[PDB]
Each structure stands twice: as C-alpha cells, then as structure tokens.
Amino acid sequence: MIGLVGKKVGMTRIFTEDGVSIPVTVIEVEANRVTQVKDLANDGYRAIQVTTGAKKANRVTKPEAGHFAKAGVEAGRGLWEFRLAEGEEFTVGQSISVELFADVKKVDVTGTSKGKGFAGTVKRWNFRTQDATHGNSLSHRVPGSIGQNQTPGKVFKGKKMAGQMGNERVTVQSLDVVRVDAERNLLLVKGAVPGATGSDLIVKPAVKA
C-alpha cells in the first residue's frame, strides 16, 4: 500500500519471553500528513504527497509556504510522494498515523546510505589484494590489469573501479516488524536499516511475498 516517511534513531534489542535476542531499529515516525493528491485527470497516476516534522518559519521559502498553505498544513522538512494502488483514496489534510503498520508483517526500509566517501577498489568492489611481499613493488593494493590487449583496445562500460561509495539510496527488502508502539510513535523493525543516525527513511510494506 502507501508508504510512510520516518526518522532513524539508533538501534537496540528486544528480549522475548523465550530468550531470543531480537535486534531492532527504532524508526520514529512523527506524523505524516497529506499535502497533495494527484489524479489521472491531471497527472495520469494516482499518488499522494506527504511531509513530516516541522521547519523554522524563516527557513521555509515562499514557494514552499504557498504550497503548504493551500493544504492547511504546518510546514514540514522535505516532501515525499507515494504511488497509490487501484483504490485507497485520501484527501488533503488527512493525517496518516503510524497505525497503518499495526497489522502487516514485513516492511521495506529505504534511505540514504552512510556515505563511506571516495573508496578504493578493495573497499568498494571487494577486490582481493595482491601479495604483500615476495618482491611485490608499488602494488600492494592497486587493482591491477583492467582490460585485454589490442583486440578490445578500450575498457568496457561497467568495469569496476575506484569511485564514490555510499551516500545513495539503498533499499533493504522484507524486514520483519516487531512492535508498533502507537503512543510514542516508534516502529521497531528487525535487523539493520540503512542510513546514518538521524536521516530520512521511506518505510513501506513488503512489495513481494
């Protein structure tokens, strides 16, 4: 169904009665409120647009201010858009709670990965290193040969090399939900979600089964 945007606040564990230690991750979902609803009559695809949190008045600009104004919504940080599914119609001003996950089993967390920075070939594509000694000169960690000889006479598009690793959108699929605390607005999901402590997180039900 529809997605739900939240914030990532550390991770701990939950001891069950049997003694199984389940590692959870605390995703605080403030209160996602619907900003705009798109239809076939104007855009060709049914989708909703949400926002969350709060932003300082002198930080949100007039373009954004006018937008939130026609929805009767308090300005929040960022905006997100979720694809609807054949029939689950909402409306502007509708306050989506965290209650929508009180029944589902598996969810999918999607968020900006912890940016490792400009990583080498070993750190990124898992290239096995060369001999640390036995005469090996000036090539303890380098990638080594990256192509064939004259016949190709180029380097194929897709060749793994040293580049920017991390700081991109990564989706971990099918994570078991553990507890859905209504009051405190916490969403305990099993395992480790992506992203640094305090980034955004698009949480939505398991697309596959």
């Binding site: 606040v9 550390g10 701990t12 564990r13 939950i14 001891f15 069950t16 009665e17 003694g19 230690s21 605390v26 605080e28 405190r184 916490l186």
Partner: protein
C-alpha cells in the same frame, strides 16, 4: 537520544547484585531440553564486566574437566536468573584477561574481606 533510552529502561531488570572483577560468582541460567525448563548452574570466576546499561555483560571463566571454559552473559536477558556471589575478590585491574594463561596454583586470587 531520549526515545531510545525509554525502550532500554522498560526492559532492564532492577535486581542484580553488584559484583566486581575477581568475584567467584555462581550464575544460574535456564536451558531447554526439548520441553523441560531446567535450571542449570554455572560456577566460575568473573573476568571482565562490560557496562552499557541494557546491553551490559559479564564474562565468567570456569576450569572444567580439563578445558578452561569461558562464557559471557547478556546481563539483562531472561535466560539468566541469579548472580549469586561466593567470594568477594580483590585485584587491582578492571579486566582480568591474564587468567587465560595462568593455571592451577598461580591462577588464584585474594579475597577482599572488608
């Protein structure tokens, strides 16, 4: 932060005796033999204590029938029942890792007695 602290507090049991590194502690834990909730005892010397609130754990070392068997315990797990103390020890070091080489006689420690 604040919210993560509350989820740690409501799980943390509040009845664990204070024990210092070097205390001959007897720890009783549960075990499942199919369908029998049996209580197994475990004697030993507490080597190191790692305090992290909810995630705290202490390490116990026992000289079994010929093999030095070490084991840790996630302090606040329902799998652990008692942290009954026997000998209040006293050694001038927080972590007792040197007891992994010491054997028999030279592997003992003094009592606190105060």
């Amino acid at each position: 932060s604040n919210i993560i602290k509350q989820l740690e507090q409501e799980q943390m049991k509040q009845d664990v005796p204070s024990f210092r590194p070097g205390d001959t502690v007897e720890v009783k834990v549960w075990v499942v033999e199919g369908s029998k909730k049996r209580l197994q005892a475990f004697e030993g010397v507490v080597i190191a204590i790692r305090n992290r609130g909810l995630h705290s754990a202490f390490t116990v070392r026992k000289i079994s029938n010929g093999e030095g068997v070490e084991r840790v315990f996630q302090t606040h797990s329902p799998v652990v029942d008692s942290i009954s103390v026997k000998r209040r020890g006293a050694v001038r070091k927080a972590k007792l890792y040197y007891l992994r080489e010491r054997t028999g006689k030279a592997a003992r420690i003094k009592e606190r007695l105060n």
